[PDB]
Design a protein around this ligand. Structure first.
Ligand SMILES: *[C@@H]1O[C@H](CO)[C@@H](O)[C@H](O)[C@H]1NC(C)=O
Lengths: 195, 178, 203
């Protein structure tokens, strides 16, 4: 029985720049448990029908989890632009899979956790699909070398969401789980109960 | 056998930056929370930060919040700590440490963190101080403000590391008073 | 200061039973988080000694035990052996800070001999150092046992915490302990106030 519960119901979630990836393999996947009672639950699939998942079989499945702003839940989709799509988490234009998200204001908006969720704001190039940049090197904005310290035209690349419960929904923290269904010319190891 | 080897320490001046790393060996890295714990010379253990099995930052010691950044890399079995705007009181031995429990944890449960395996520490020193000679004064029956250590005297006490980041110690002879 | 509170020093003779207390708050121990205990030697990395409030890691003898109640936890050592001399740290989680929290640490001395007493010798500022920029009073502490010593200065029966630095207890070539305390002043301060005192507190 695949460990979706651990993934979706983790106590903490990763920052978007250091998004987590969990291989799901050699297991039976009850996709009917993919739900919760958080306020703005979304479940969006691309090139695949979620009503067929439990009659489908895959080589492997990956669950990518992270937290972003509500504003940005739209950037987690094929062919999107913006800070998150460009510098933090990128799906390919050809993406097949599902993006599951929900409002997590009740957990991720405490002051004590103000630095727990970060995002990359400056970067030399855009990330290719499914790349992860967890580097913390000063970003040279211009001509002069930075010599390891932040200053004029030299920025620390990561900024903090600093979530607060009093903010508008669009600024509140949302937990996101991205499911990629790998399909190789190899034996299936992840099947729904019906298959 | 579990092995945790810190690296990235060294001497650094206030305001500069440093990235520590910990190579994890001998266990399923991504089943466990990882922790950074630091210990200033002759003081107690202070938790710096920690990160869950799914790369979820737990928190930060309020003395480093905003300046340090934890991150893990589950493909390279690695733990990291970016340290920015280093202060003198950030000087310490920094331990990597594996969490005792492989329990996944869920949001409606109380977290439980404890570290069953520790690495040896990478030393981090934050100091403004260049080499400086001592200026000594009446001593036996004071060698002050020097760097680096050691200093020779021919009962000589171990030195204090002062505000200046420079050392000071005293030797004393107890002699017949005639 | 640590959020969990621990006695700086405990001591007993071989064979006796000693305990170490660890008190917390509504936020951490009284909130229901487990409490863990660690054991460290000078120059050594820590070692897990008790987890989940009363479980002994394999290889920790049954003469260590742990308990947690309300806002407090306690480590008990019943057959005290010279080997047990080490620093012990309790540890828990604090939901107010969303972080792991360590206690201040406890120096446990297994008494070999009766307590020794500190010899304290204070020195004024030197004449040729008041001719220079500064003034520094030296208070050197030798031959005490156990190795727990708190130094406090007083300027005209008043507390002083502006300019002092104290050393950690060092072993001698003897198995007794030493410590230095240095109080920095200006030549003004040294005659502005009248009489300075070095106060040493030991077991
Ligand atoms: C998350 O836990 C709740 C239990 O309240 C359960 O109903 C839900 O289905 C869990 N999620 C998964 C994916 O198993």
């Amino acid at each position: 029985l695949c460990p979706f519960d651990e993934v979706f119901n983790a106590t903490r979630f990763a920052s978007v720049y250091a998004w987590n990836r969990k291989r799901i393999s050699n297991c039976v996947a009850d996709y009917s448990v993919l739900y919760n009672l958080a306020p703005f639950f979304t479940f969006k699939c691309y090139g695949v029908s979620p009503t067929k998942l439990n009659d489908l079989c895959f080589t492997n499945v990956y669950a990518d989890s992270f937290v972003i702003r509500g504003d940005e839940v739209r950037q987690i989709a094929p062919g999107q632009t913006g800070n998150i799509a460009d510098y933090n988490y990128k799906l390919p234009d050809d993406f097949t899979g599902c993006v599951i998200a929900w409002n997590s204001n009740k957990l991720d908006s405490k002051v004590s956790g103000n630095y727990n969720y970060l995002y990359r704001l400056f970067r030399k190039s855009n990330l290719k699909p499914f790349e992860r940049d967890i580097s913390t090197e000063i970003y040279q904005a211009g001509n002069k070398p930075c010599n390891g310290v932040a200053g004029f035209n030299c920025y620390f690349p990561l900024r903090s969401y600093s979530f607060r419960p009093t903010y508008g929904v669009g600024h509140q923290p949302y937990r996101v789980v991205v499911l990629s269904f790998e399909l190789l010319h190899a034996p299936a190891t992840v099947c729904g109960p019906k298959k | 056998e579990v092995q945790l080897v810190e690296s990235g320490g060294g001497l650094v001046q206030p305001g500069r930056s440093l990235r520590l790393s910990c190579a994890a060996s001998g266990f399923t890295f991504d089943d466990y929370a990882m922790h950074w714990v630091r210990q200033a010379p002759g003081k107690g253990l202070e938790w710096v930060s920690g990160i869950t099995w799914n790369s979820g930052t737990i928190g930060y010691a309020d003395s480093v919040k905003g300046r340090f950044i934890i991150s893990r890399d589950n493909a390279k079995n690695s733990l990291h700590l970016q340290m920015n705007s280093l202060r003198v009181e950030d000087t310490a031995l920094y331990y990597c440490a594996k969490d005792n429990s492989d329990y996944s944890g869920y949001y409606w449960e109380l977290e439980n963190y404890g570290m069953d395996v520790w690495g040896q520490g990478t030393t981090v020193t934050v100091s403004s101080a260049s080499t400086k000679g001592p200026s000594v004064f009446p001593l036996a029956p004071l060698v002050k403000d020097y760097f680096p250590e050691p200093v020779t005297v021919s009962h000589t006490f171990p030195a204090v590391l002062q505000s200046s980041g420079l050392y000071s110690l005293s030797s004393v002879v107890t002699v017949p008073s005639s | 200061q640590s959020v969990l509170t621990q006695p700086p020093s405990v001591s007993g003779a071989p064979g006796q039973r000693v305990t170490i207390s660890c008190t917390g708050s509504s936020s951490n121990i009284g909130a229901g988080y487990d409490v863990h205990w660690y054991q460290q030697l000078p120059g050594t990395a820590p070692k897990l000694l008790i987890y989940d409030n009363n479980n002994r890691p394999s290889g920790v003898p049954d003469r260590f035990s742990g308990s947690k109640s309300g806002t407090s936890a306690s480590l008990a050592i019943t057959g005290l052996q010279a080997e047990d001399e080490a620093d012990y740290y309790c540890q828990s989680f604090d939901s107010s800070l969303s972080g792991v929290v360590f206690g201040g640490g406890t120096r446990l001395t297994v008494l070999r001999q009766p307590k020794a007493a500190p010899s304290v010798t204070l020195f004024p500022p030197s004449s040729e150092e008041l001719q220079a920029n500064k003034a520094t009073l030296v208070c050197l502490i030798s031959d005490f046992y156990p190795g727990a010593v708190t130094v406090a200065w007083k300027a005209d029966s008043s507390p002083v915490k502006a300019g002092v630095e104290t050393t950690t207890p060092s072993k001698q070539s003897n198995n007794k302990y030493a410590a230095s305390s240095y109080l920095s002043l200006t030549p003004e301060q040294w005659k502005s106030h009248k009489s300075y005192s070095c106060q040493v507190t030991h077991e």
